[PDB]
């Protein structure tokens, strides 16, 4: 029986949940249990890969999009997937709209059923994106959920899926075995036949499992890569293909009133900012791993056609590191140590000491994180790492709880993704939503700019979009970018061919929950011969 050995996410103990509405599922359910209607590959440009659905038409005035459904797909209990299971999932979004991640409820007013297998959505607002938006929505089999009576607390112990993997066959407080659904569709397609997860902790107790050859896909980050991992072993690859935007997120709701009177000071952002050394935490924390990231925006210089050089020159200084442009900037803001503990404190004389955030285990993160600390007491600013696990970090953010975290983003073919995610205030309220842009800066025009982009298909009209949400966020430098790294991914030649590589560029490679594409690289692999 060919098994291949994933980790898509670190636990402390296996918790068998496999509802893909839940943030406390395993990381092995959207995808591999649900599959998508359609799988957009972000890195070739968000080219649709359909999947269950066989086709979509987008209207002409962008207001409602049909999809075909395949024929001949079943549940893995046997039963057909058709419209019905759509219809029912989306429905649930709006009668639970805790369970709506995307904040997609805003933008589908109803899902009708032409037929047995097409349905059509129509939107409140112009958006030819929607086909993606929709393409991430988890499908649930409605012949099952209906007869469940609180989907929001069902844990779908035993689920009956249309992916590629559906069967339970081991499940243990270290490990759990997911294999081959018994009537998946594209079976014949498929030569794995379980996904083996074991339980991992951290980065320190992957490091030690991966160069000891026992895993196979991963996409965590490795230290020393070469030396520990790649020269260890000729079956040990990697391929780092370049993503999004670091950077560290400033809650502008802070309940403290001192941290409040910092943090939502655009002046002591920028000195924030200008305190650190980017090219020294990517040399340190990344060894060498990613390029520095100067735009206040956060745009990145991967997307620089998208940018208007003017506001990137005008901004530039604020993100570039200057320890005596920090410390005049504080000073002139007022922000000055009157206490002696060398430590400036706020224009009203306030003390106060920045918690910097990012989840326990992440060590890259973790080390960026003091290394900061570091950086920011030579301009004065005091602050301290701390490390609270995943769940808890994410909480304090939905929240507003935290002060100051360091987080990545999701990265698409263009600058929305990033834009999107990490700014619009839509995203900002509702149980069920990524951390992403819980800052709590809020701007009409903003909103009204990022939500205008799928609006028309003229890309000279887009730029003009792009030039106007650049300007806006840099201008109120809404976070600290830092950096934009790479989607980490290492695979073992030792049990399966077929990985995606940079002679072999299929898509994003990452197995993390999030990058659907993981379901086409997992039917590319092949056990050894
Ligand atoms: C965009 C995003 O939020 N991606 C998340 C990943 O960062 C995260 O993976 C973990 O990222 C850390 C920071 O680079 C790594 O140190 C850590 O090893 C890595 N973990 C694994 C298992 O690869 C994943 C999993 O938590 O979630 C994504 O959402
Ligand atoms: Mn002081």
């Known amino acids: 029986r060919s098994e291949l050995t994933i980790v898509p996410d670190f636990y402390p103990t296996m918790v068998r949940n496999f509802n893909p509405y839940l943030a406390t599922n395993l990381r092995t359910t959207t995808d591999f249990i649900y599959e998508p209607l359609v799988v957009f590959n972000e890195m070739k440009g968000n080219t649709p890969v359909f999947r269950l659905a066989e086709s979509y ?9 049909t999809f075909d459904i395949r ?5 893995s209990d046997g039963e057909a997937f058709t419209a019905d299971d759509v219809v029912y999932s989306f429905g649930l979004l709006k009668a639970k709209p805790e369970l709506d991640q995307r904040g997609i409820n805003k933008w589908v007013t109803s899902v009708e059923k032409v037929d047995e297998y097409k349905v059509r959505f129509r939107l409140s607002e112009a958006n030819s994106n929607v086909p993606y938006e929709i393409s991430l929505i988890p499908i649930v089999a409605e012949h099952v959920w209906k007869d469940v009576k609180d989907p929001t607390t069902f844990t779908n112990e035993n689920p009956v899926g249309t992916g590629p993997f559906t069967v339970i066959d081991t499940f243990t407080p270290q490990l759990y075995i997911q294999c081959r659904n018994p009537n998946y569709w594209d079976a014949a397609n498929l030569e794995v036949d379980c996904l083996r997860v074991p339980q991992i902790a951290n980065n320190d107790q992957l490091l030690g499992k991966i160069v ?8 965590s980050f490795v230290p020393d890569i070469d030396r520990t991992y790649a020269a260890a072993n000729p079956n040990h690859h990697y391929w780092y293909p370049a993503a999004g935007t670091q950077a560290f997120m400033v809650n502008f709701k802070n309940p403290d009133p001192a941290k409040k009177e910092a943090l939502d000071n655009v002046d002591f952002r920028r000195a924030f900012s200008m305190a650190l050394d980017r090219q020294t935490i990517i040399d340190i924390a990344f060894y060498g791993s990613g390029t520095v990231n100067d735009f206040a925006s956060g745009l990145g210089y991967a997307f620089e056609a998208w940018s208007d050089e003017a506001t990137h020159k005008k901004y530039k200084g604020f993100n570039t590191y200057d320890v005596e442009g920090s410390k005049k900037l504080l000073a002139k803001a007022g922000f000055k140590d009157v206490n002696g503990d ?8 306030k003390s106060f000491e920045l918690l910097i955030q990012s989840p326990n285990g992440w060590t890259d993160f973790n080390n960026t994180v003091q290394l900061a600390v570091e950086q920011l007491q ?15 970090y994410n909480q304090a953010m939905l929240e507003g709880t935290y002060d100051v975290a360091y987080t990545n ?7 929305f993704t990033y834009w999107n995610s990490g700014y619009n205030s839509a995203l900002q309220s509702g149980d069920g939503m990524p951390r992403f842009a819980m800052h709590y800066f809020t701007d009409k025009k903003l909103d009204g700019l990022l939500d205008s982009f799928y609006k028309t298909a003229d890309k000279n009209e887009q730029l003009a979009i792009a030039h106007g949400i650049q300007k806006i966020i840099a201008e109120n430098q809404v976070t600290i970018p830092v950096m934009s790294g790479a989607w980490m991914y290492q695979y073992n030649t030792t049990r399966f061919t077929g990985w995606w590589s940079e002679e072999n560029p299929k898509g994003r490679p990452s197995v993390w929950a999030g990058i659907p594409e993981r379901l086409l690289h997992v039917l590319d692999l092949k056990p050894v011969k």
């Open 57 to 65: 038409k987008m209207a002409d005035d962008l207001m409602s999009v």
């Open 71 to 75: 024929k001949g797909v079943k549940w």
């Open 212 to 219: 000891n050859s026992e895993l196979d896909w991963t996409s």
């Open 342 to 349: 060398g430590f400036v404190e706020t224009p009203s004389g």
């Open 378 to 392: 030579e301009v004065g600013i005091k602050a301290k790492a701390r490390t609270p696990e995943f769940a808890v």
């Open 409 to 415: 983003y999701f990265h698409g073919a263009d600058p």
